[PDB]
């Protein structure tokens, strides 16, 4: 059983600096160099970077290169870019196709200069309360390294309700972008009077806060 | 100009069976291989299946234990899930490859991929609702509101603003899907405070739903 594995998620890259990442095969790729490259964001398909271990893609930026043989394949990307944020995967090609696998995957986090969010808070609307359930919404913008989100609500740190989303980085200037919200009933969010975001990042908070009856 | 597209993928209870479709333009079938492959949310990219359009040759990963049938026409190219499981819910993409008759190489085409949901909860619009700041004491000249569309299966929806005439910096969330098994999101978007109001257009293809929701 053909087994593909890369370098481990996550590898942080300097913008302007070089990264290589790594898959190594349990047994010989077709004739010893049958590996293809893909770079993959969300929300759009595959791209081929290198084919055959070492042979660039049509169209594809000189910045990447691949090397290796045999068993052991490298992919390294120069000048990195902060649209270089992406996934790769390599995929490796045997004499029975019904072989053929992709590694796991190696995101590549690409290091731009570090912003602390603004961050926003939504109360639910008139409209959602009358559902009976309702969520409120705080989004942290344009931010890098990662954050901590922690709720609370008239004091009380909230352990339960709670979903975020993260958009991939921004390919211009590497920074995030996220949704946190907290899922309540509406009586539960009637019996409360201040709702409070707080967004951490290393020994830097941003807090946001609204009380429920001055909107 | 050659190119790939998908279709077919859709919301489909656990055992019931669904086909999906590649469809070529630009170039011949029987010129190429063609190859099936996978991405399930939060998993890697998998490979399916390969049909070779000058041959006979035709390939499942040893992992499929028939799982999936390919087949072709004179224009498209099909992959047959044969009893899907919760584990098949993924976008499926369609690949062009080089070598029409035994032995592949360099995928460099590549369809937008079609999105499959198997699971046993009916098709389910959004409900969307208008994100507004509280507002402080200083007026500011800008302003950031949203739309919250919550609670629709099965994914994509796609969100708009102003019909499209208003694009600049908008932030529209990835899903997340909660325990319900409906999906939520939410997009928001700066403007100036003199611009105002400013509509979000949501759509959900699977139920043909369009709503538009005027934010204050
Ligand atoms: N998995 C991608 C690698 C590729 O498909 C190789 N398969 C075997 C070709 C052999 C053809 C030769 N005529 C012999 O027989």
């Known amino acids: 059983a053909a087994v593909l594995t890369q370098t481990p998620s996550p590898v942080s890259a300097a913008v302007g600096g070089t990264v290589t990442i790594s898959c190594q095969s349990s047994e010989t790729v077709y004739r010893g160099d049958w590996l293809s490259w893909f770079q993959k964001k969300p929300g759009q398909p595959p791209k081929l970077l290198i084919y055959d271990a070492s042979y660039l893609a049509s169209g594809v930026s000189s910045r990447f290169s691949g090397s290796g043989s045999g068993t052991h394949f490298t992919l390294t990307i120069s000048g990195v870019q902060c649209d270089d944020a992406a996934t790769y995967y390599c995929?490796?090609?045997?004499?029975?196709?019904?072989?053929?696998?992709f590694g796991g995957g190696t995101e590549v986090v690409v290091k731009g200069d570090p912003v602390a969010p603004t961050v926003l808070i939504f109360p639910p609307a008139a409209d959602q309360v009358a559902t009976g359930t309702v969520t409120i919404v705080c989004v942290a913008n344009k931010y890098f390294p990662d954050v901590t989100v922690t709720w609370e609500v008239d004091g009380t740190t909230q352990t339960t309700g709670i979903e975020n989303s993260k958009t991939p980085q921004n390919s211009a200037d590497c920074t995030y972008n996220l949704s946190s919200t907290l899922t309540l009933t509406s009586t539960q969010y009637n019996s409360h009077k201040e709702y409070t975001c707080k967004v951490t990042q290393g020994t830097t908070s941003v807090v946001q806060s609204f009380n429920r009856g001055d909107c | 100009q050659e190119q790939l597209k998908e279709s077919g993928g859709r919301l489909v209870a656990p055992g019931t069976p669904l086909t999906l479709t590649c469809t070529v333009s630009?170039?011949?079938?029987?010129?190429?291989?063609m190859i099936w492959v996978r991405q399930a949310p939060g998993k890697g990219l998998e490979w399916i299946g390969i049909?070779?359009?000058?041959?006979?040759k035709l390939a499942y990963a040893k992992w499929a234990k028939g799982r999936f049938t390919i087949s072709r026409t004179s224009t498209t190219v099909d992959l047959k899930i044969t009893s899907p499981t919760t584990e098949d819910t993924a976008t499926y993409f369609c690949?062009?490859?080089?070598?029409?008759?035994?032995?592949?190489?360099?995928?460099?085409?590549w369809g937008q991929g079609t999105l499959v949901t198997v699971s046993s909860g009916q098709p389910k619009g959004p409900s969307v609702f208008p994100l507004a700041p509280c507002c402080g004491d200083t007026p500011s000249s800008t302003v950031t509101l949203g739309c919250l569309v919550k609670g629709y299966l099965p994914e994509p929806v796609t969100v708009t603003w102003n019909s499209g005439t208003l694009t600049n910096g908008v932030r529209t969330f990835p899903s997340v899907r909660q325990s319900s098994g409906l999906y939520s999101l939410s997009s928001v978007v700066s403007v100036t405070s003199s611009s105002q109001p400013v509509t979000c257009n949501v759509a959900h293809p699977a139920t043909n739903t369009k709503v538009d929701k005027t934010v204050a």
């Open positions: 630009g170039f011949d079938i029987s010129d190429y291989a």
């Open positions: 690949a062009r490859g080089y070598g029409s008759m035994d032995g592949y190489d360099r995928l460099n085409l």
């Open positions: 995929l490796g090609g045997y004499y029975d196709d019904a072989d053929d696998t």
């Open positions: 049909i070779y359009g000058g041959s006979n």
